[PDB]
Design an enzyme around this catalytic site. Structure first.
Site, PDB file in Angstrom:
ATOM      1  N   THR A  56       0.824  -1.200   0.000  1.00  0.00           N
ATOM      2  CA  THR A  56       0.000   0.000   0.000  1.00  0.00           C
ATOM      3  C   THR A  56       0.859   1.251   0.000  1.00  0.00           C
ATOM      4  OG1 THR A  56      -1.796  -1.098   1.197  1.00  0.00           O
ATOM      5  CG2 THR A  56      -1.772   1.305   1.192  1.00  0.00           C
ATOM      6  N   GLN A  57       0.704   2.072  -1.034  1.00  0.00           N
ATOM      7  CA  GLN A  57       1.434   3.324  -1.139  1.00  0.00           C
ATOM      8  C   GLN A  57       0.595   4.541  -0.803  1.00  0.00           C
ATOM      9  OE1 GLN A  57       4.419   1.483  -1.265  1.00  0.00           O
ATOM     10  NE2 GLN A  57       5.042   3.442  -2.161  1.00  0.00           N
ATOM     11  N   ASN A  82       6.155  -2.907   0.344  1.00  0.00           N
ATOM     12  CA  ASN A  82       4.742  -2.870  -0.031  1.00  0.00           C
ATOM     13  C   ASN A  82       3.897  -2.986   1.229  1.00  0.00           C
ATOM     14  OD1 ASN A  82       2.347  -2.866  -1.427  1.00  0.00           O
ATOM     15  ND2 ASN A  82       2.703  -4.798  -2.503  1.00  0.00           N
ATOM     16  N   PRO A  83       3.936  -1.976   2.094  1.00  0.00           N
ATOM     17  CA  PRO A  83       3.521  -2.159   3.486  1.00  0.00           C
ATOM     18  C   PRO A  83       2.008  -2.217   3.652  1.00  0.00           C
ATOM     19  CG  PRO A  83       4.017   0.109   3.107  1.00  0.00           C
ATOM     20  CD  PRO A  83       4.305  -0.585   1.815  1.00  0.00           C
TER      21      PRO A  83
END
Lengths: 215, 191, 201, 199, 204, 213, 220, 191, 215, 199
Positions: free
Chosen positions: I1-2, I104-105
């Protein structure tokens, strides 16, 4: 002006036999929001010349202020001289060219129509100081959309009567209502003759939607 | 920030929230967003706080000096003309959302709109601010020509309460003002 | 950081400083910048601390296996070549490595220079480091191939002293190794503040 | 890039520069002079940008001569050096800064010889020897090795020759010739030009 | 940074009836030294000094502009300058270059011209004054100087132990710094006399 | 956009004695201009003769500690003995270099006893170069502690002072005094002081309060 | 940096802390953050320390010039109008966050000034980095028209909430009580943070430092 | 683009404009923004055109295959679960504004919302699109619990006409659909 | 999540004598638009542990899906073992740390409350894998706003009863309503005891606006 | 930067390079060799990056020797040159491109002598003379002036000496020594080393 906040849209204009007719809508869109949906975008200069504009509207009120003063300042002399429509087209060109040279331009695109000495006049003024004359003009997307409809008739028939010209604009204003995201179904038509400058009211169009029943 | 102005037969009605924020933190919980200029002319301001406070003090200085010369009450259109001169000249430098309304002896109630560009226009009713887009379709389905004063106080109170419920930069408390020939009726409302 | 190495009639001399910095902050003063690979090979630490420490230890892991399989020590030109090929696979990924390889060989003395860019070259004298250019002047004025043993000890000890004087990123002690035919031998390790009184008189 | 050197003696100042005026690959002029006689006992060496060397140093050149004609006596090398530093620092925070590197050599009748150092950020220093350019790195540790404060002018030319031959050995630029001056109680004397048979 | 272009370290420390000030000696461009006799402590009248650190251009420039304003002050008034008056004078000179600022951080130490009362203060690069009662430091190796002075300072100290404290503070902190060193000079002043000593430091 | 690192503060101190080792740290866990907790010691008892400290980015400190404790068990079932102090320092350098192109943002100091019963301190860097020292200070207040320990332990820049080795009781008050001076000038330091002492009889712990601002 | 103010039933209590930092290193353990303006008006400073010092002395110079020319006691709205008109001219380049308070003929008045030139009249304000922690104590524990000791207890509680948040102070909570007739100013009002004692022997010897060159110069 | 969904006692009511634009030019003057999936489940799509056409064909393939196995009519919550799986997985790649509504035998009328993030929530009524912010305060002052079908057809027609009047990317013609247990009543309206 | 699209806000939590109480609001703001004003942000894990979260909400439904499966998978064994609240805090830490290492947290910040074996538990989990325990926790702006009110009481009094703790949260939830631009006057309170997990309904606050009559 | 030269004769090929291995200011090695005997009648000259010269040219060196041992006869200089071009162009559109500049010198029993030119973008050319580096600019117009296709090997060494002395005059880099080979019907013969007494 670096960022135009409240903008207009396309303005049409075409000569005919003994006059020039100009139309534009009455919308003050802010980005995509149609925020000001009742404004006038056509200025009646003294008795022969006549101005409509596109682009930024706050800059248009500035030129509406300055040109309004210059016309008053000549009428107070009473020497029997007035500004010809070609002279307003000359003055407005030098005002725009001097303004971009300071890199602080006026975000507009203006159409000048005038009828003097039995001669019609129809002039264009760009933001960058590009100016010319033509028997038919269109700004905005109307240079892409309504302009081929204007040129096809004038090449097939060089002169037009007043009823032919006024009917032809309402067709082009209809087509701009279908395929322009900043259009609005309320416009006004201004016309110069030898009788003077006359501005018609908030007219509307008539649309067709029979292709919606198709798949 | 949401501001509101409706004219009626006698005069005009103004209204606003408070909630002066900074990013996501409320700096000021209760705020006079509407400002007196002369005895009959108010303005409600939006955009940058330090800009609109500086402009409104300059117009009050100019208009207040101008009426003592004429020995006449000022016109509302004269006051809206002065905001246009500062905003159009000092554009690219200011973010101002001024709405000018007030009663006039020559003309009664009037409402003018000066957005961030610098243009000026008269309207029957005018809104503005960040949370103005949310009640923006409510207001023209609910507006009706020929209201009384008490209907317009009811009209703007329901109009502001929907954005104050919804917009994160808006809310707080409702400040209202009614300007007519008689006096100025200011009140603080919650509901 | 300042290292130097030169070969002459009686083997190879290796000398280095001992200061390691971090920006404008001195981490330590007792850093051993001459990595003892084998009893017959020596390597230096010039540019990057963990990069020179890892890949030379991986080279020492490699040369021992070569000795067990072939029953013979590796040559100096071979050990320089194996280190050059391992680093070249990571070219452009941001390694810092500027070491030198020293050791006696069947062909005699051996001195090779190895970059992280892949500059495997031989030579007679080298000096690597931030204060390296301060050492090339004083060493080449005094260098001869026919120097004595005690004379060559005084030359390299002087050359590190002149480098740590002008440069800010060089100081600490001055280590000194001597590569002989049988194997390397540690000579001495002197502090600069002790050498300052000796050299000033 | 180009080179200066500043050996100071007990009663003399030995200076030398190079004679190269290159243009980006080629070497347009091989007898170029970088030495400016400010007065009868003061020299000036200037290394910097392409235009700022001639424009700035001639401004100081003609301005010290005005002091001589108007007062009748000569500036000291201390005050002449400390006037130049005032002119960079004033002209530094401007749209037109000068980017030059200087060193000054003077002899005083009262204070003897003197040597000064100047950065392009206008910092003064009083040094027993100095150098500029990229060749300043390789050579000044040699000059730090064999320097003696009580040195003779014959040893100083010999120490200058040691200082230049290692720049002939391990420096990538060409630099074949080197002009040498000397300043004593009499005035500026020109020593012989130093060139190099390489191989 | 621009403050880290030449290095430097200035320390002042208050004693019982005396005050001491110290600085390093190294002048050099970023990694290459040039000389070891660069003055960073300037006398401003008797029993009142000033120390400068930072960009060596602005060290010499501010010390000449401040001397320009001092001599005009001490001629319109027959008296000498008070230590508080100098601190207000320097902070005026730095704040005039508010947006073109000099890259230096002064340290002022001195006694009262009438009584014996010591005084120390230091300023920022735009002129925020700060008076203390124990010590002030400035330069690149600031954090090393705080660690020594917090442990070694005592309230009421004779000029003997004041000298030994600021010596052990400057020698140990500067040897941990890379771009400062090459000798340390110490001024210890008092009501009767002024003592200047130079210490035996690491020249590496 | 997303950045994978953040700074958490902390200060680690170790001193190798003649037959002992002392590892100390504060318990403050901070981020930016906030205090997460006032109780988070950085000491970790690996074996009965080895204590490690971990500073820097805290999410890597939790990961790296759990990797080491797994590989201690992997050594022991494969070799029937516990690791030495020097063997752990050799193993950790390979682990830190194994992520050379996406590094751990962790400063590490290993203190403990050798096989001869003497103190041993190994300092580290985030990429995995190490050396044996007598004393190191790592973390945020590292620059405020190294010049003082050079004076007291190393006896640097002192004239005519004899070199008595550091006793255990004298070393305790040196550790308690350097953190009081560090808590005055550093903002990432305070709220407690956890001290671990490694001897030939086990590991003792001791907690001394600091200022709470 | 944590400054706060309140308006009780008779006057105004101002509060501040005593730390100036540089980077993340405590530079000053005792910095006076409450500035004099007039014998009835005081001001607290936050932001750039040199910008607040030079600004608060200029306006204090002009009000002394104005009141001595007028011949009567100054007004707080005069000090507000000078500050907000000065800071707007610099377009926020001067970073100064101010809390302005005083007692006029009309009564007590409290303002908060932002470095772009926006001002607010409020019964209680907090400014600075630790302002969020101090506003917690006000918004929980404010009631209108408090007494004297009730107001001093509130501000000393609200400043202490910021000190035990980060970037607090080497705490010496300052108070300035302004009333209609009495003026108070208390630098060591509460000292909660005490430095612990030093337990080590640090025996220094007269001669444990080598000296290369000595020099003696007498005086008079 | 403005889409609309209101449930009532029998089933649900859907609605949308057309005006597929590209920059400031209308590419398609009349457009089916609402799409059949099964016989009782529609969706109305917003965001990128080529993305939402590709997603809706995949869900129709998966749900249409899934009900033939069970020999049962599908659940509306099952259909909304499949859009969530594609949008949450292929986020940072798609711009989808899906609203799923339809009648179910087990549960009657249902309305689900899948915005650009990838979350899923059931609502009594749901709007979306670019011009959804304008009628956004009108809709919750006008909504009333317990409407009939003919009120909801009147409710969404006045709701969409305000944004279509106002938003430049919206307008064209109103397409409506009523889904109940009996059938699907689709109609094209202008007014 | 960006890029977090639909976000929540601050979540509170504090231990007491024999349990942990956690509160959060019911708002799904999209930038500044309070788009989803009726959602639940507290998940009841099996009988002792309990989870609330902040940050992105679509990522929260993912962890609500995965943790929901793991609890079912242990109950089907029936061996008398369950996940302790410390074990969920361990597992969730490794899930977040592994996720950022792929760059890609998961854009969340999570608070875990649990009561097992007569012991309360209160744990924090960051997006970057930073985890710790504390007697009082607060995310979002509540770490700046409500956190000093929590610590002042716990230092003056280390233990709290249930009525003291529940009353103290409603004060802190009131203060967050005044000065947070993403707050909402409708929240819910969840509480673990030895009797299990209990979630109270959509509670509301009581505001004061008497300072509005002041100038 | 460094220099190559390629004089082609009627029955011989004259090649020469320089011997410098500098590191950014200093000159680490002054007897460096850039000449690679691919076979008994084929040389190879390589100029490029710091690592790509040794890695690539030794890959070609050992691969041509494999052709000799396995077939029993030697490659022609045409096919040996045209195999190298295949290896750059394949390895060009990759994460690891080689940045070297080559020229090839060979003698054939059937075709006589041959000279080839190679860019770092792998373009072949058949030239009567060639050069690389920055010194290629100053020198090849001299070589264009006095070239004759029917030239003797004694004139070619003399023309090589004219070609190098002007690079001693107007080129900023040092470049003192120059190694020279010659290839004829017998094989690679090493001529004497060329050095320069400058002044």
């Amino acid at each position: 002006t670096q960022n135009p906040m409240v903008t207009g849209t396309s303005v049409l204009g075409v000569k005919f036999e003994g006059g020039v007719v100009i139309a534009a809508d009455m919308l003050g869109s802010y980005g995509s929001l149609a925020r000001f949906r009742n404004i006038s975008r056509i200025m009646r200069v003294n008795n022969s010349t006549m101005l409509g504009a596109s682009g930024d509207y706050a800059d248009f009120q500035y030129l509406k202020q300055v040109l309004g003063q210059m016309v008053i300042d000549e009428e107070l002399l009473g020497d029997g001289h007035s500004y010809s429509p070609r002279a307003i087209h000359s003055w407005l060109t030098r005002a725009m060219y001097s303004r971009r040279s300071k890199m602080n331009p006026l975000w507009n695109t203006m159409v000048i129509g005038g009828y003097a000495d039995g001669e019609s006049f129809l002039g264009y003024v760009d933001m960058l100081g590009v100016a010319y004359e033509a028997p038919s003009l269109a700004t905005g997307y109307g240079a892409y959309l309504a302009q081929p409809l204007l040129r096809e008739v004038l090449e097939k028939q060089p002169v037009l009567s007043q009823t032919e010209a006024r009917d032809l604009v309402e067709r082009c204003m209809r087509v701009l209502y279908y395929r322009d995201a900043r259009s609005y179904n309320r416009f006004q038509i201004a016309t110069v003759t030898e009788k003077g400058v006359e501005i018609e009211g908030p007219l509307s169009t008539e649309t067709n939607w029979d292709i919606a029943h198709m798949i | 920030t949401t501001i509101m102005a409706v004219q009626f037969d006698g005069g005009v009605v103004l209204g606003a929230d408070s909630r002066t924020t900074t990013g996501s933190y409320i700096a000021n919980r209760v705020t006079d967003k509407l400002t007196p200029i002369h005895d009959r002319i108010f303005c409600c301001r939006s955009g940058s706080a330090a800009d609109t406070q500086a402009v409104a003090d300059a117009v009050t200085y100019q208009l207040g000096f101008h009426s003592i010369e004429l020995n006449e009450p000022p016109l509302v259109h004269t006051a809206a003309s002065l905001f246009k001169e500062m905003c159009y000249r000092y554009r690219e430098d200011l973010m101002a959302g001024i709405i000018i309304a007030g009663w006039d002896p020559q003309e009664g109630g009037q409402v003018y709109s000066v957005p961030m560009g610098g243009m000026m226009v008269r309207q029957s009713f005018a809104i503005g601010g960040s949370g103005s887009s949310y009640i923006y379709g409510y207001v023209d389905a609910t507006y009706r020509e020929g209201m009384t004063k008490e209907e317009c106080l009811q009209f703007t109170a329901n109009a502001l309460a929907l954005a104050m419920e919804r917009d994160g930069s808006s809310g707080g408390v409702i400040r209202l003002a009614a300007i007519a020939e008689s006096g100025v009726e200011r009140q603080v409302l919650l509901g | 950081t300042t290292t130097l190495a030169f070969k002459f009639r009686h083997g190879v001399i290796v000398a280095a400083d001992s200061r390691a910095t971090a920006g404008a902050y001195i981490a330590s003063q007792t850093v051993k910048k001459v990595i003892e690979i084998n009893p017959y090979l020596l390597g230096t630490m010039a540019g990057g601390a963990a990069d020179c420490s890892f890949w030379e230890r991986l080279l020492a892991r490699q040369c021992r296996i070569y000795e067990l399989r072939n029953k013979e020590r590796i040559s100096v030109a071979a050990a320089s070549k194996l280190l050059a090929n391992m680093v070249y696979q990571y070219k452009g990924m941001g390694l810092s490595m500027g070491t030198m390889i020293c050791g006696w060989d069947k062909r005699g003395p051996g001195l090779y220079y190895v970059d992280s860019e892949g500059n495997r070259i031989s030579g007679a004298t080298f000096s690597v480091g931030s204060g390296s250019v301060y050492a090339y002047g004083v060493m080449d004025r005094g260098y001869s191939y026919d120097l004595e043993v005690e004379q060559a000890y005084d030359l390299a000890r002087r050359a590190i002293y002149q480098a740590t004087y002008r440069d800010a990123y060089s100081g600490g002690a001055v280590n000194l190794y001597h590569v002989r035919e049988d194997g390397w031998i540690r000579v001495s390790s002197d502090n600069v503040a002790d050498l300052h009184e000796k050299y000033s008189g | 890039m180009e080179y200066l050197i500043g050996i100071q003696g007990p009663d003399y100042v030995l200076v030398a520069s190079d004679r190269v005026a290159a243009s980006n690959i080629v070497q347009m002029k091989d007898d170029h002079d970088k030495m400016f006689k400010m007065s009868e006992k003061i020299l000036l060496l200037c290394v910097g940008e392409a235009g700022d060397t001639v424009q700035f140093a001639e401004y100081i050149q003609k301005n010290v001569q005005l002091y001589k004609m108007r007062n009748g006596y000569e500036l000291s090398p201390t005050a002449a050096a400390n006037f130049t530093r005032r002119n960079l620092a004033d002209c530094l925070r401007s749209r037109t800064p000068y980017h030059v590197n200087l060193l000054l050599a003077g002899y005083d009748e009262h204070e003897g010889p003197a040597l000064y150092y100047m950065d392009y950020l206008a910092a003064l220093a009083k040094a027993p020897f100095a150098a500029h350019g990229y060749g300043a790195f390789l050579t000044l540790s040699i000059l730090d090795r064999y320097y003696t404060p009580t040195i003779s002018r014959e040893r100083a030319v010999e120490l200058l020759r040691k200082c230049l031959e290692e720049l002939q050995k391990r420096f990538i630029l060409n630099l074949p010739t080197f002009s040498v001056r000397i300043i004593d109680k009499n005035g500026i004397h020109d020593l012989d030009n130093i060139s190099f048979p390489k191989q | 940074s621009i403050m880290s272009y030449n290095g430097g370290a200035v320390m002042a420390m208050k004693g019982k009836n005396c005050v001491a000030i110290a600085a390093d000696r190294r002048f050099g461009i970023q990694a290459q030294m040039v000389t070891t006799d660069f003055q960073k402590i300037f006398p401003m009248g008797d029993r009142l000094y000033i120390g400068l650190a930072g960009l060596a251009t602005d060290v010499q420039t501010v010390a000449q502009r401040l001397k320009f304003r001092l001599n005009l002050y001490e001629l319109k008034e027959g008296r000498q300058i008070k230590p508080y008056t100098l601190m207000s004078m320097v902070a005026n000179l730095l704040y005039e270059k508010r947006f073109g600022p000099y890259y230096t951080e002064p340290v002022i130490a001195g006694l009262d011209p009438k009584t014996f009362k010591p005084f120390i203060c230091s300023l920022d690069l735009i002129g925020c004054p700060m008076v203390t009662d124990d010590f002030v430091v400035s330069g690149t190796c600031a954090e090393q100087m705080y660690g020594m002075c917090e442990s070694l300072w005592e309230p009421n100290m004779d000029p003997d132990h004041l000298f030994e404290t600021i010596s052990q503070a400057m020698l140990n902190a500067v040897d941990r710094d890379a771009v400062s060193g090459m000798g340390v000079i110490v001024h210890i002043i008092e009501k009767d006399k002024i003592t200047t000593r130079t210490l035996k430091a690491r020249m590496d | 956009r997303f950045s994978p690192y953040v700074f958490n503060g902390g200060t680690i101190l170790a001193i190798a004695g003649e037959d002992f080792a002392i590892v100390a740290s504060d318990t403050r866990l901070s981020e930016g201009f906030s205090i997460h907790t006032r109780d988070s010691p950085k000491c970790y008892k690996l074996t009965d003769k080895t204590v490690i400290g971990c500073s820097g980015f805290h999410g890597d400190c939790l990961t790296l500690t759990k990797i080491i404790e797994a590989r201690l068990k992997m050594y022991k079932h494969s070799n029937n003995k516990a690791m030495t102090t020097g063997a752990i320092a050799a193993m950790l350098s390979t682990i830190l270099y194994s992520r050379r192109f996406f590094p751990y943002y962790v400063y590490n100091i290993i203190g403990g006893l050798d096989e001869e019963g003497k103190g041993a301190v190994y300092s580290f860097d985030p990429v995995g170069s190490y050396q044996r020292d007598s004393f190191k200070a790592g973390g945020s207040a590292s620059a405020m502690l190294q010049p003082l320990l050079d004076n007291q332990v190393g006896f640097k820049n002192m004239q005519n002072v004899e070199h008595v080795p550091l006793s255990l009781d004298r070393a305790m008050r040196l550790v308690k005094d350097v953190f009081i001076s560090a808590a005055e000038r550093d903002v990432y330091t305070g709220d407690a002081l956890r001290i671990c002492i490694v001897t030939k009889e086990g590991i003792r712990e001791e907690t001394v309060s600091l200022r709470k601002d | 940096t944590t400054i706060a103010g309140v308006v009780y039933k008779d006057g105004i209590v101002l509060g501040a802390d005593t730390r100036a930092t540089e980077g993340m290193v405590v530079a000053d353990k005792n910095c006076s953050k409450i500035h004099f303006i007039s014998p009835n008006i005081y001001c607290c400073g936050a932001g750039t320390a040199a910008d607040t010092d030079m600004t608060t002395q200029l306006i204090s110079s002009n009000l002394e010039l104005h009141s001595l020319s007028t011949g009567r006691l100054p007004r707080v709205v005069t000090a507000n109008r000078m500050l907000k008109q000065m800071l707007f001219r610099y377009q926020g380049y001067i970073g100064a966050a101010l809390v302005l308070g005083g007692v006029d003929v009309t009564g007590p008045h409290l303002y908060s000034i932002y470095p772009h030139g926006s001002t607010d009249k409020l019964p209680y304000v907090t400014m600075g980095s630790g302002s969020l922690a101090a506003m917690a104590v006000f918004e929980d524990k404010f009631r209108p028209d408090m007494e004297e000791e009730e107001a001093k207890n509130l501000v000393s509680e609200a400043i202490a909430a910021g000190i035990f948040n980060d970037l607090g102070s080497g705490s010496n909570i300052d108070l300035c009580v302004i009333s209609k007739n009495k003026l108070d100013f208390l630098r060591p009002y509460t000292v909660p943070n005490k430095k612990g004692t030093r337990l080590g022997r640090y025996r220094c010897e007269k001669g444990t430092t080598a000296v290369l060159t000595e020099k003696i110069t007498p005086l008079e």
